UniProtKB/Swiss-Prot annotation, chain B:
Species of provenance: Mycobacterium bovis (strain ATCC BAA-935 / AF2122/97)
Protein name: DNA-directed RNA polymerase subunit beta'
Coiled coil segments of this chain: none
Family: Belongs to the RNA polymerase beta' chain family.
Function in brief: DNA-dependent RNA polymerase catalyzes the transcription of DNA into RNA using the four ribonucleoside triphosphates as substrates.
Quaternary organization: The RNAP catalytic core consists of 2 alpha, 1 beta, 1 beta' and 1 omega subunit. When a sigma factor is associated with the core the holoenzyme is formed, which can initiate transcription.
Residue window of the full protein shown: 141 to 288 of 1316
Source organism, top-level taxon: Bacteria
Curated annotation (Swiss-Prot), chain C:
Assigned protein family: Belongs to the RNA polymerase beta chain family.
The protein's assembly and partners: The RNAP catalytic core consists of 2 alpha, 1 beta, 1 beta' and 1 omega subunit. When a sigma factor is associated with the core the holoenzyme is formed, which can initiate transcription.
Cited function: DNA-dependent RNA polymerase catalyzes the transcription of DNA into RNA using the four ribonucleoside triphosphates as substrates.
Source organism phylogeny: Bacteria, Bacillati, Actinomycetota, Actinomycetes, Mycobacteriales
Residue ranges the record marks as coiled coil: none
Shown residues within the full chain: 100 to 148 of 1177
Name assigned to this protein: DNA-directed RNA polymerase subunit beta
GN (gene name): rpoB
Species whose genome carries this gene: Mycobacterium tuberculosis (strain ATCC 25177 / H37Ra)
UniProtKB/Swiss-Prot annotation, chain D:
Gene from which the chain derives: carD
Disulfide bond sites: none
Protein name: RNA polymerase-binding transcription factor CarD
Role description: Controls rRNA transcription by binding to the RNA polymerase (RNAP). Required for replication and persistence during infection of mice.
Family of the protein in this entry: Belongs to the CarD family.
Shown stretch of the complete protein: 3 to 60 of 162
Length: 49, 148, 49, 58
DNA sequence: CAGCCAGGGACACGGCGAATAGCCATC
RNA sequence: GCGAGAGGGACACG
DNA sequence: GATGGCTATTCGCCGTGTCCCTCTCGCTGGCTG
């Protein structure tokens, strides 16, 4: 998803005037991590008694 | 269909004038083609050329004749489609090819009603006799047989 | 094909807070992730990291 | 441009050049000037032949 | 950037019922 | 004071 | 050659037990100062 976003915003941004820090949008990756660890069918609540 | 009945000859006669006019256009194109082929003839026979060269200019002119008369045939087919639709413009039927329908309505805006969408289904329901079709189905069940 | 972007050097920092502290304070026990980029240009030629 | 001389690379601005690298691409060793701006936090590497074309200047 | 707005495909089976597909018959 | 997901208990061997 | 008209094949639609306990999470994007 992040690669989709970065390649799409590459066109709009003018060349020789932008940086990878300005290209990479990290919201989708952290969102994917969060939605895996939370509310997923394998990140099960720990069964410790 | 009322208008349909009568126009069944007047509209066809005007349409037949269309057929004649477009066929005359076709044969005029073919005559121009034959004239340009005679051009090819004399030109190549004189213009420094090879035997097969003038053979092939003749062949190309023949091919041009062929494509002209073919286009004429295709537009004649299109005419036939218009007349087949209007003659067989039975109600409660589906007409594909939006371009076709536009042709009909601009040429035959009257003589029928056409629509598309839910409101078309509404109109079909309004102009639809329950008793007539019920009696028809009673006849079919009483007399028919099989899948029907 | 006028440019390209690449990644490398996946590095993990030390965890922000220890295990019991994270369990108590509703904090997710995570560590920051740092990845080095390389934004190569072709029309003019330069790589950005 | 020489090592240790502060240079202006637009649009970012001031930066400090670390060294000249001769890494090979297509079998040719290129004068890879490598330059760093603290604010941008970006390693700008360019051949010295086309340095003026990109616009880097003192 | 946030209040307040709003706008891209995976292991199931079994049975029932309708719409075709393919093939022999006749005008 | 709803939905999804996960785990779990109870359910004839003549 | 097309409508009838019979058998076969796809292809959708419908269904597939009851009761209870616990836990955790709940969609994404733009204007603008």
């Amino acid at each position: 998803r992040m690669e989709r976003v970065v390649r799409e915003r590459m066109t709009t941004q003018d060349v020789e005037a932008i940086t990878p820090q300005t290209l990479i949008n990290i919201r989708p990756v952290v969102a994917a991590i969060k939605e895996f660890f939370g509310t997923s069918q394998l990140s099960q609540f720990m069964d410790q008694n | 269909e009322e208008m349909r009945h009568n126009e069944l000859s007047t509209l066809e006669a005007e349409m037949a004038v269309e057929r004649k006019a477009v066929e005359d256009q076709r044969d005029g194109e073919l005559e121009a083609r034959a004239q340009k082929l005679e051009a090819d003839l004399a030109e190549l026979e004189a213009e420094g050329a090879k035997a097969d060269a003038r053979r092939k200019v003749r062949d190309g002119g023949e091919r041009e004749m062929r494509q002209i008369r073919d286009r004429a045939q295709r537009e004649l087919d299109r005419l036939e489609d218009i007349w087949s639709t209007f003659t067989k413009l039975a109600p409660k039927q589906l007409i594909v090819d939006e371009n076709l329908y536009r042709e009909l309505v601009d040429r035959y805006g009257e003589y029928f009603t056409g629509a598309m969408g839910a409101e078309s289904i509404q109109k079909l329901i309004e102009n639809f006799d329950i008793d007539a079709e019920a009696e028809s189905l009673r006849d079919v069940i009483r007399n028919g047989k099989g899948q029907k | 094909g006028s440019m390209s972007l690449s990644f490398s050097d996946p590095r993990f920092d030390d965890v922000k807070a220890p295990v019991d502290e994270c369990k108590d304070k509703d904090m997710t026990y995570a560590a920051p992730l740092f990845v080095t980029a390389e934004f190569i240009n072709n029309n003019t030629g330069e790589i950005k990291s | 441009f020489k090592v240790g001389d502060t240079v202006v690379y637009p649009h970012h601005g001031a930066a400090l050049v670390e060294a000249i690298e001769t890494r090979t691409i297509k079998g040719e060793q290129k004068e890879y000037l490598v330059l760093k701006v603290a604010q941008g936090d970006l390693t700008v590497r360019v051949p010295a032949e086309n340095a003026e074309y990109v616009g880097v200047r003192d």
